[model samples]
Target: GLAVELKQSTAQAHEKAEHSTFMSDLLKGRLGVAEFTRLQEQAWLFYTALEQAVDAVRASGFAESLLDPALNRAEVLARDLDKLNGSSEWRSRITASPAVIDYVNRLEEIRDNVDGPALVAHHYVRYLGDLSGGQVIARMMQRHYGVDPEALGFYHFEGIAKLKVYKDEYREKLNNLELSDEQREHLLKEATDAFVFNHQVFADLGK
Candidate 1:
């Protein structure tokens, strides 16, 4: 029920995110490494915070089925940064965008409060998008940018199988969370906020 509701509630926001100007340039190879790297850097900011929040929620054994290590992005993103720039030269060039700073703050609060449903909302927005659209974004990046394989580790899942299975399984996990009516509505709202945060990040990168 939540899976269905989540999809319907967030459909317009999801569509708007996909149609962003940054994404248009990205798909057409009109952008360059500075833009791509900035996007990844912003991602690193929020994903790192999201993972920390995830760990905090896990420490309390909440959202167990919906949260796990295999869904992580920050580690791979970090490793990619090391490969792309080496360790010392990495943060020397990075300044987190204001939107990403606010995004990270949101995740930090969720982590600090051990907010399970809110975390679940954020998790669903990210990982599901990764499974479905991110796979193609990787291919398009390679096709357009000719980016090295080693630096694309953020898109690679070492041991994962079918995308179809994982997405369905993830949605099933969400439905199985068994949240109450108000909590479910809260999750839907948070998921919308997740999309808003994403749209803002893309807009910042475009500017």
Candidate 2:
């Protein structure tokens, strides 16, 4: 019964998100543009897959330990970003876009400072926030800069807000489980995969 339910729910969520009007709009927009999708962009796609994996783990009676950190990471990333000029930071870059350079720096910082497990959990949540914010930014850009989808591929194609909402719901669904050591380890691995995605996003910057 549990397995059936989990698969059913995930399938429905996946379809709804995939076929959403906003998502369709975004894809069309990106296709219209010639820019290559960056690491940050890939992160959005990869993170969605991770969410499904996390959901399966939780549904198998696993507890979600990273829930708090996941929430905090998302909040922190958005809050900090609110204090700066997001567009300016990227535009001021001389070689590569500022967005790409800054992303690369943060990925290195995560490798150096955060422990393996925390890094994954934090990044999983943080990246979601980044995407969510990007969607809002995309809307603004369209309004102000007269930009088309091709011009705004980085920030607005995938619905980051939609991603976070699903993640939060996943956590809530697993709020009452008991996590074993093996499950914790798996969570760490998932988080690390997230960092690798981050690394790739910034790798080509300044090159």
Candidate 3:
């Protein structure tokens, strides 16, 4: 199945992204609070669009099964930012990087186009990565930045009892999707594109 193939085929891209300068610095506990805050700001942009699109999908009768309240991150991101910067201060302080702007623009494109499966590509890339390597990032943020786990709300999933269980269930839902070959191809391509966009964002952060 293409779902299985997507993970295997994109393994290298995913690995490269995981080793990106942004992520490398993050994992090594070298990322500054300011830089990490910027990353979260960009994430807020992407996820605001994403959650809105999820609502659109539900309204359009596209894929209700793909809708998971527990997966929402934008609100949590805001909470984290609020903790880092006062509730009203974070927005004015953030200037989205070019790559982040591009990424958010792509999200808007997918949303406006009513492309559910493609949007799922974005969701898959972001949330799954969050569940996986993001755990490590959360730990590093605490170790290096002295951020309280309570403050890093974006990485904490109170709704999910177990990360692995939820991830496996998410994958099962993805695999069971009834997509045509063309749609499946598009989804896979979008997934790869998502990784490319992430790497670009990371690269931009380093510059």
Candidate 4:
């Protein structure tokens, strides 16, 4: 029930953030390549730091099930940026938005947080999203941007044959965690914070 409750608490913020004008324009293929490039640049920062957080948590004794390779997007984000920018030195050309800088800092804090359950909150908000609405994003980009599906590897999960099944299993892991009620609430709150930071990133991009 904690898993369901966590999703419920953050659903509104998630929806509102996902539907931001910048995201809407990009999803509809109306945004220009420059804007999309900027998006991927910011994404590179997020995923790069997120994957490091994921690694830290796992190394520090979080469940291996939570660190699924199929869900890893940092390397793919980097490769996608290289492809889009037509250079291995794209990282040198791109400067992260202030929002992204703050976001990555928060992730580092989460990774180093004394309460490791907080890491679970960040993991749930991001990886679960990649399994859910992120698929639609991949489709939208290909449909509108003339991007080849192969070029969209950031959104592809080669290990999972079925996403719903994977997501169902993921929720089970969350529900089955041995955390107390207080910890569950903390995770839920952190999930909401994740959405807030994400929305801010989009808003910053739009401005």
Give the top-scoring candidate (TM-score): 1
Q: How are the candidates ranked when ordered by TM-score, highest leading?
A: 1, 4, 3, 2
Q: After superposition, how far is residue 44 of candidate 2 from its true place, in Å?
A: 8.9
Query: How well does each candidate superpose onto the true structure, as a TM-score?
Result: 0.95, 0.33, 0.94, 0.94
In candidate 3, what are the lDDT values of residues 15-131, reduced to their tens digit?
Answer: 888889777887687768878877888788778987887777667776667678788888889988898776758787777789888888888888888888888788888888888
Clashes of 2: 3
lDDT of 2 by residue, 102-121 (tens): 44344445444433333445
Write model 1 residue lDDT over 1-207, tens digit each, in one string: 889999999999998988899988988899976677778888988999999999998889888877868888898898888766657477677777888988899999999999889998899888888878886888887888887887888888766777688788888888788788888888899999999999989989888
Q: Which stretches of candidate 3 lie over 4 Å from their true place?
A: none
lDDT of each: 0.86, 0.41, 0.82, 0.82
The parts of candidate 1 lying over 4 Å away from their true place are none
Write down the lDDT that model 3 would get: 0.82
The CA lDDT at 168 in model 1 is: 88
List residue ranges in candidate 4 displaced over 4 A.
none
Clashing pairs in 3: none
Report the Cα RMSD per candidate.
1.3, 14.7, 1.4, 1.4
